[model samples]
Target chain A: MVYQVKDQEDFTKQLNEAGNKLVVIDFYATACGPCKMIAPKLEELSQSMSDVVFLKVDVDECEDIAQDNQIACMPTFLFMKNGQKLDSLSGANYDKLLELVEKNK
Target chain B: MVYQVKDQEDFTKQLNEAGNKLVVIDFYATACGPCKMIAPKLEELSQSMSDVVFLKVDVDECEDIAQDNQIACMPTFLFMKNGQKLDSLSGANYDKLLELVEKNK
Candidate 1:
């Protein structure tokens, strides 16, 4: 089966259901070089920060999800909690990615 | 200022408002190489198909939009008419891209 990103309605529900847990949302593309650059870091981070729920959504497959977030750039990361957006990171910077994750977690 | 992809509700509204026109939706990632490969073609198609509403949404920034659309690949394309889907193409293949457009158009 094809990978499915949760719909806006469903993702919202999931975030709400997650309660106070930290949520890391990665909006990415398979063709993106920068996204690939961060993939390893993301994997390691996931292991380190098991406390956070890391969710990966393919933008090409989920236009509505990307549109809803008003994404202008590629590789945008959203730090969310209880459905409230705490912070956001754009671009494919490795250090910045870590910084946001560290601060949020 | 950051660029924003439309939310699911709004994008659906836009597609609906387009009304029977061939709506071309491109799901792209900033870091995706394949997406970039087809970017120029998309621009050309948009110009050639004035009857078609070519909309580009960045996946990284628009998780909600992507999630709602069930996007799983980079540079995914959706062809719609009157709010109903007609055809779709994924990947960065040039021949396949033209085939889908030709078939649909």
Candidate 2:
């Protein structure tokens, strides 16, 4: 499943749950190249972090959340626990991401 | 004249100068509507704050800077003093923006 949030209401609920579990949220756009660069790593993380709830929110669809978060760049990540943000990272660096996930979790 | 930077190489130099004086950078995209909604107000601010170095950076044209800034939405404003950021106000709220400019100055 994509675990996508289309609007504010859905995004809110997802964000709330983010802090409860080891939630990995990816902020992406359909046309962004750098965003696509991290695709394989994301898939790997999803598989490895089975306990972590994987969610992908498209900025194009959930415009309000994107605005609220000040997501000016593609592929922003928010690692959450119990609806509170723990650690976050951006960019398409896979090695750095793997390190972040391991360190945070 | 609208102060605009085409790429990050130029953006860095401009951002550095932002610290010396009040530099208001507008992050916008051409295809977006809300970004256009705030256009008139931005122009008014430019006319009013003659001391404030007005800038309008199109994210579409300046992709690298947009990536660096994490700008996921349109109409993001960065208020700077002496090349460093003082305050930032996003969204298309005219009343709130007016208040922010006044308070920051």
Candidate 3:
């Protein structure tokens, strides 16, 4: 399921808990139109890819996470495996996300 | 009370309703620390200054408002009276805001 990871503590907690599992983090802004558009699809993708740990970071609230991950734009997806970042999609990329999830699996 | 202006229509409507009355729009981000700190003070100020219109614009949800007004920071206060921007405060300065309100009146 999707989880909202907001601050340093929560971010660390989520990432640590998902250690060794594929983690997908969507860094978004609340007012971003594209971010809004991708929510439902992301949720569905998370549901379909049950093994993948899905996370959402609201950039404003989770500025540290965004900065640490080098996420400058909304809809950026940080793909991780074994507790480190493996790849990332810095935009709204559905097919790439699914492909990455499958490749990691 | 605080009015949440999310979109263009709602912002326009709120401004129209406040015709010639003093309007104070607080452009804030959801996760902004200072913004959260100022909430209680703002609510109390709104209650005390009933004649003044208090509005809130979440930068992410109302980016257009921020863009058009040239708000580059969180906790920016846009002071309007007579349908024109009379003054503005870039940070959380309660005394200055109160002073400006008094000056406008």
Candidate 4:
């Protein structure tokens, strides 16, 4: 499921408890044109990839979460494994995005 | 005018002749969602920013140009001044994108 992060506390709790699963966090803003464009693709991936945990954080509404992630750009994809960042892709290239997810998975 | 780079040769010629003007080249693909989303915004900017030269290149159609620029993501915006790359923004954040352009302008 594609989960929407509630707050920084919730995000912290979830990340800490992710264990061996791969976590993909999408840091986005409502007004960002690319963020909107990538939402459906992310949602589809979240649904299809059962082993991967997909989460979304609205940078505008969750400023603390955005700050914690050190996100300075919209549609920043963070790949985490066992509570540590594995890799990050900073754009909306679907092919590379899929490659990163598959590589981590 | 928003220029569409016909090929790698054309791009090189334009960049070399840009002189002191700020050159914004958008490296994109037809299948990229963010590229589609950002097209109108970029077009609008091209119209509004009279002093900044805006250009677009389709990575698929211009593979040589894409390789030359080392573009691995869609909607990659490269900022150039006087034939040298000043900076690059890899995502589709309107505010930040505008800020970068305005700062260089």
Best by lDDT: 4
Candidate 2 runs further than 4 Å off: A6-20, A31-41, A59-78, A83-104, B6-20, B32-41, B63-104
- Lowest summed lDDT window (length 10), candidate 3 chain B: B29-38
True contacts kept of 2: 0.00
Residue pairs clashing, model 3: A31-B60
Q: Residue by residue across B19-103, what tens digits does model 1's lDDT show?
A: 7777778888776756776788778877776776788788787887777776655677877787778876655656776777777
Model 4 chain B poorest ten-residue lDDT run: B29-38
Sort by DockQ, best first: what order? 4, 1, 2, 3
Q: Estimate each model's TM-score.
A: 0.49, 0.55, 0.50, 0.60
Looking at model 3, residue A67 earns an lDDT score of 71
Please report how far candidate 2 places residue B63 from its true position, in Å.
4.9
The residue-by-residue lDDT of candidate 4 on A1-105, one tens digit each, is: 678899988888888767789999998766665567778998999899988889888877898877676564568899998878899888666787899999997
Top candidate by TM-score:
4
Q: After superposition, how far is residue A18 of candidate 4 from its true place, in Å?
A: 2.3
Better of 1 and 2 by TM-score: 2
Docking class of 4: incorrect
lDDT for model 3 comes to: 0.78
What docking grade does candidate 1 earn? incorrect
- Write the residue-wise lDDT of candidate 3 on B4-105 in tens digits: 997989988999999888999998777555567677889999999999999999888777777898654457788887778889775556777789878875
Which is the winner by lDDT between candidate 2 and candidate 3?
3
Estimate every model's Cα lDDT from 0 to 1. 0.72, 0.72, 0.78, 0.81
Off by over 4 Å in 1: A1-4, B1-105
